[PDB]
């Protein structure tokens, strides 16, 4: 059933709310996911001024429902499944030698659009680190998350870590504590072992007056033999 809201082009409508040692920021942005390509595209809006943060930190928390499943791991794809009325998902996301964000969004349908609602808090992080400081390049690599079920809760797990490119030309660590849980309490598909591949394009729009990202990207499901 869930997986049959995604059959064509889905549009979407991002908010997050945050506060980054107690710097209070707001963004919005709307965009079009396409699941059985894997393919999404957000433009996104901050409406507060100029982030706190660096963009790139944010790419994260800002749809695991877009993914493409092959036809061969279908039943393996819970976050479809706990569609239309969705899932919670939280993260720790610790910072290398810095502070951490704690998020809890909620994704789910209002009327025919999917809708991604997260709270953000960052503490303990440092004002000449790399994130307080502004020092990350404005780009992302690939990555896999890898998916595991989590049979008490009825959801999923998953941890990872993510590199930040810094501008001086290292790379600073993030890593990543999620959990999935449905909001409704239907049938959701609990999977076997895989992962999630992630590509991702950070971009501008030359015509635009906020301070802002476009960000495009590419998730296909991998690793269930046959």
């Not at 809201?5 to 709310?17: A, K, M, R, Y």
């Not at 506060?19 to 409406?47: C, M, P, Q, Y």
């Not at 049979?151 to 990543?176: P, S, T, W, Y």
């Not at 449905?182 to 609990?190: E, F, N, R, S, T």
Request: glycine share 10%; hydrophobic share 35%; net charge negative.
């Amino acid at each position: 059933k869930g997986e049959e809201l995604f059959t064509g082009v889905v549009p979407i409508l991002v908010e997050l709310d945050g506060d980054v040692n107690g710097h209070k920021f707001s963004v919005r942005g709307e965009g079009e996911g396409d699941a059985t390509n894997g393919k999404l595209t957000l433009k996104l809006i901050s409406t507060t001024g100029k982030l706190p943060v660096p963009w790139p930190t944010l790419v994260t928390t800002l749809l695991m429902v877009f993914a493409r499943y092959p036809d061969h791991m279908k039943q393996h794809d819970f976050f479809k499944s706990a569609m239309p009325e969705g899932y919670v998902q939280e993260r720790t996301i610790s910072f290398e030698d810095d502070g951490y964000y704690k998020t809890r969004a909620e994704v789910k349908f209002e009327g025919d659009t999917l809708v991604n609602r997260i709270v953000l808090k960052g503490i303990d992080f440092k004002e000449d680190g790399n994130i307080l400081g502004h020092k990350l390049e404005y780009n992302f690599n690939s990555h896999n998350v890898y998916i595991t079920a989590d049979k008490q809760k009825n959801g999923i797990k998953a941890n990872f870590k993510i590199r930040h490119n810094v501008e001086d030309g290292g790379v600073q660590l993030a890593d990543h504590y999620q959990q999935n849980t449905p909001i409704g309490d239907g049938p959701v598909l609990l999977p076997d072992n895989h992962y999630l591949s992630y590509q991702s394009v950070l971009s501008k729009d030359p015509n635009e007056k906020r301070d802002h990202m476009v960000l495009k990207e590419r998730v296909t499901a991998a690793g269930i033999t046959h």
